[PDB]
């Protein structure tokens, strides 16, 4: 094994690689959302830029797992980054609903990794998750849920005026 | 009696303690409103922060009565702070309507204390009320009444778009 | 359930509401202590201001739990804030002794919530407790215990000169 | 009558002159206290300077009544300023006790003037009293009462060390 490796279970190493892939997948989904809202027949630029920012954040999350893996003496193993589920995202409400579910999927995988880390008695991995990932997921989920509530209040999907207002006053 | 006490009737001392409790009660009600508007299924953050600011203001009003009591040689006597009337506040209009009534309740109690102070020939307590409390109540009542008028104009409770617009352009 | 809720047990939600109430209770107790030391027949202003600062800190702790509850998709449920145990606090030593016990009561409730969070496999709630509450309790308990030791050394309760010296050189 | 005079009763004019004299009397008493604490066989300089500052404040209070009288179209009528009650003031405790009573005497005369102003339906004089005098008396009385409490705690009159400590840590 690596000269640095200490208290790092093979199962945790593998799960970190799988989580890295999911972070990359999330990044790629958000890129798709950005591109959709930048279309000339969609044209909600503030919405598009929200999703672009999230794409960048997810890619950073992936980089941080690569660094983590190496610090522990594990080995980064990459897999294909699957294309997003959809090619088109409907409207701001549908997209935010998809984003909420994505963030919850990410969160569940982080929680599952934390449970594995617990089971393997790996406090360093627990700490990393708790300090760098779990709170940010709660914040994202809350923000996107708040947006959904507001989009519903604004009459989405039918109310175009409401959609316009959201883009111009919410997506700060 | 206290070495400092001069021209301070026992009835006024007791009424100051009761008023302190009401200020605390008002603070607590506004906290409830803050929490409600911060819910993910409510999500009117500017509204929530208006109510949080008012909660803080009411707590300051209570502190000022504690200090007043001691300055006059009275004795602070605390009672339980009753929980708010409601657990949930409906929407911005209902909440503002409740706030208006709360502010009027507070005002009436301040006015009643001023009448007692008058009857007991306590110009210092009259002055304190007039200089630190009575005008601020008039301002609050006016502001919240103006908000109500605007929420009605905006089509509350039914018009969600109107509610959104209020949160984004009024609650400065 | 709330659209945001994920891995948040009903028991933990309820326990967060109970803890919020205890934080508020602690705030209110410290306010009483402030008022007592501000009395003209007590007149230990630095002591009074220590307790006022702690009252404000506890209220902030309560606010942070309200925000936490909403972030997780729980619902803030308020109860009455019970008045403090005592109306008068004796002297600096007795008050500090009461404060120590209050801080220990708060701490025990935080520790119990952490155990519940552990049992329910809620690492986010564990982290929140560990990062925002548990260390601050240890610091408070240590500070107040150190004060007690010094008040005893200074001859409290009988030695008034010692009490004066403490107010003028310790309560920074 | 004076061309300016409006709603100013002769009784109120006379009472303002009497109050002016009392302010001057209070100033003179505090000067005596200053001189006593500056004696080489007393030598409590911070105490002395507290009393000197109060002497100056009382003289300012007197000047403000002279200006008030002229503004209303009354006529300043001066009387002798009686020498203080005592030539020597014992110690810090006795002096503070005398100061408390002086401040209460001043306050009672202000309150009596306010009652006369009320009876004569003179809101301008009421306002002047409330805005420029009555609160400052409450503050002085509270401060001096707090000092007394501390001097007693410090073992005055017998405890010289306590008296020294008060001069060096209280009279800010
Ligand atoms: Cl290993
Ligand atoms: Cl292994
Ligand atoms: Cl992108
Ligand atoms: Cl598609
Ligand atoms: Cl849709
Ligand atoms: Cl985080
Ligand atoms: Cl009285
Ligand atoms: Cl009475
Ligand atoms: Cl609040
Ligand atoms: Cl309700
Ligand atoms: Cl309604
Ligand atoms: Cl005011
Ligand atoms: Cl859940
Ligand atoms: Cl549950
Ligand atoms: Cl307080
Ligand atoms: Cl008691
Ligand atoms: Cl004791
Ligand atoms: Cl902490
Ligand atoms: Cl006239
Ligand atoms: Cl006349
Ligand atoms: Cl002088
Ligand atoms: Cl004499
Ligand atoms: Cl004496
Ligand atoms: Cl004043
Ligand atoms: Co991520
Ligand atoms: Co990067
Ligand atoms: Co842990
Ligand atoms: Co983020
Ligand atoms: Co108030
Ligand atoms: Co405050
Ligand atoms: Co205000
Ligand atoms: Co606390
Ligand atoms: Co706060
Ligand atoms: Co602290
Ligand atoms: Co004066
Ligand atoms: Co002058
Ligand atoms: Co003054
Ligand atoms: Mg090797
Ligand atoms: Mg392996
Ligand atoms: Mg495929
Ligand atoms: Mg941690
Ligand atoms: Mg953190
Ligand atoms: Mg937000
Ligand atoms: Mg007494
Ligand atoms: Mg009474
Ligand atoms: Mg009840
Ligand atoms: Mg005013
Ligand atoms: Mg206005
Ligand atoms: Mg729902
Ligand atoms: Mg439940
Ligand atoms: Mg009870
Ligand atoms: Mg920490
Ligand atoms: Mg220390
Ligand atoms: Mg003429
Ligand atoms: Mg005349
Ligand atoms: Mg004579
Ligand atoms: Mg004033
Ligand atoms: Mg003071």
Q: Scanning every residue of chain A, which has its alpha carbon at the shortest distance from the alpha carbon of B43?
A: A146
Alpha-carbon Rg of chain A, whole angstroms? 18
- Chain centroid, CA D65 distance in Å: 13
Range of the domain at D35: 1-172
Q: Detail the DSSP E strand segments found in A14-170.
A: none
B99's CB contacts (< 8 A; 6+ apart) are B30, B33, B51, B54, B144
Q: What is the D113 CA–ligand 56 centroid distance (Å)?
A: 25
Pairwise CB contact (< 8 Å): B70 & C34: no
- Between CA B117 and CA B125 the distance in angstroms is 6
Work out the number of other CB atoms within 10 angstroms of the CB of residue B136: 15
Those chains having 3 or more beta-carbon pairs within 8 angstroms of chain D are: B, C
Report how far apart, in Å, the C-alpha atoms of C144 and of each of A37, C36, C55 are: 57, 18, 15
D3: which 2 tokens?
């061309």
Do chain A and D touch: 3 or more Cβ pairs under 8 angstroms? no
Pairwise CB contact (< 8 Å): B81 & C77: no
DSSP codes, B9-33:
-HHHHHHHHHHHHHHHHHHHHHHHH
Backbone angles phi, psi at C81, to 5 degrees: -95, 110
Do residues A30 and A94 touch, judged by C-beta distance below 8 A? Answer: no
Q: What is the A135 CA–ligand 5 centroid distance (Å)?
A: 29
Contacts of the segment B43-51: beta carbons below 8 A, 24+ positions apart: B43/A145, B43/A146, B43/A147, B43/A149, B43/A150, B44/B92, B44/B163, B44/B164, B44/B167, B45/A146, B45/B167, B46/B167, B46/B168, B46/B170, B46/B171, B47/B92, B47/B95, B47/B166, B47/B167, B47/B171, B49/B171, B50/B171, B51/B95, B51/B99
Backbone angles phi, psi at B81, to 5 degrees: -95, 110
Report the candidate in C84, C86, C24, C76 with the shortest Cα–Cα distance to residue C55. Answer: C24
Report how far apart, in Å, the C-alpha atoms of B61 and of each of B18, B23, B79 are: 13, 6, 16
Burial annotation A92-126 (CB, 10 A radius, 16+ → b, else e): bbebbbbbbebbbebbebbbebbebbeebebeebb
Q: What is the DSSP letter of B157?
A: T
Q: Is C168 on the interface with D (CB under 8 A)?
A: yes
Q: Could you give the 3-state DSSP secondary structure of residue C25? A: helix
Peptide bond connecting C118 to the previous residue in cis, omega within 30 degrees of 0: no
A27: which 2 tokens?
């990044």
Q: Could you give the 3-state DSSP secondary structure of residue C81? A: strand
Q: What is the DSSP letter of D171?
A: -
Method by which the coordinates were obtained: X-ray
Q: What is the DSSP letter of B81?
A: B
Report how far apart, in Å, the C-alpha atoms of D17 and of each of A38, B90, C162, D63, D78 are: 82, 62, 48, 11, 7
- Between CA C35 and CA C49 the distance in angstroms is 9
- Between CA D5 and CA C93 the distance in angstroms is 61
- Between CA C58 and CA C105 the distance in angstroms is 13
Report the candidate in D98, D77, D103, D102 with the shortest Cα–Cα distance to residue D88. Answer: D98
Do residues C96 and C144 touch, judged by C-beta distance below 8 A? Answer: yes
Report the candidate in A61, A151, A136, A57 with the shortest Cα–Cα distance to residue A98. Answer: A151
The number of folded domains in chain A is 1
Do residues D154 and D168 touch, judged by C-beta distance below 8 A? Answer: no
Domain of residue C123, CATH code: 1.20.1260.10
B75's CB contacts (< 8 A; 6+ apart) are B2, B13, B69, C39
Do residues D149 and C42 touch, judged by C-beta distance below 8 A? Answer: yes
Peptide bond connecting C157 to the previous residue in cis, omega within 30 degrees of 0: yes
Residue D60 burial class via C-beta count within 10 angstroms: exposed 0-12, middle 13-18, buried 19 and up: exposed
Straight-line distance from the first to the last Cα atom of chain C, in angstroms, rounded to the nearest whole number: 48
C26: which 2 tokens?
């602690």
Q: Which among C1, C18, C31 is the top mutation candidate for probing chain B, defined by the most B β-carbons within 10 Å of its own β-carbon?
A: C31
Those chains having 3 or more beta-carbon pairs within 8 angstroms of chain C are: A, B, D
- Between CA D99 and CA D92 the distance in angstroms is 10
- Between CA D161 and CA D169 the distance in angstroms is 12
Work out the number of other CB atoms within 10 angstroms of the CB of residue B159: 16
Alpha-carbon Rg of chain D, whole angstroms? 18
Report how far apart, in Å, the C-alpha atoms of D56 and of each of A171, B12, B110, C43, D43 are: 61, 34, 37, 26, 21
Q: What is the DSSP letter of B130?
A: I
């Amino acid at each position: 094994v690596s000269q640095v490796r200490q208290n790092y279970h093979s199962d945790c190493e593998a799960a970190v690689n799988r989580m890295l892939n999911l972070e990359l997948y999330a990044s790629y989904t958000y890129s798709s959302m950005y591109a959709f809202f930048d279309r000339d027949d969609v044209a909600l630029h503030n919405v598009a830029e929200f999703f672009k920012e999230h794409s960048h954040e997810e890619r950073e999350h992936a980089e941080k797992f690569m660094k983590y893996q190496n610090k522990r003496g594990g080995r980064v193993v990459l897999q294909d980054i699957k294309k997003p589920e959809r090619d088109e995202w409907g409207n701001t409400l549908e997209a935010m609903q998809a984003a909420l579910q994505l963030e919850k999927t990410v969160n569940q995988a982080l929680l599952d990794l934390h449970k594995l880390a617990t089971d393997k008695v790996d406090p360093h991995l627990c700490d990393f998750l708790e300090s760098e990932y779990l709170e940010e997921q709660v914040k994202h989920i809350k923000r996107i849920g708040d947006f959904i509530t507001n989009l519903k209040r604004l009459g989405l999907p039918e109310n175009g005026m409401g959609e316009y207002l959201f883009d111009k006053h919410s997506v700060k």
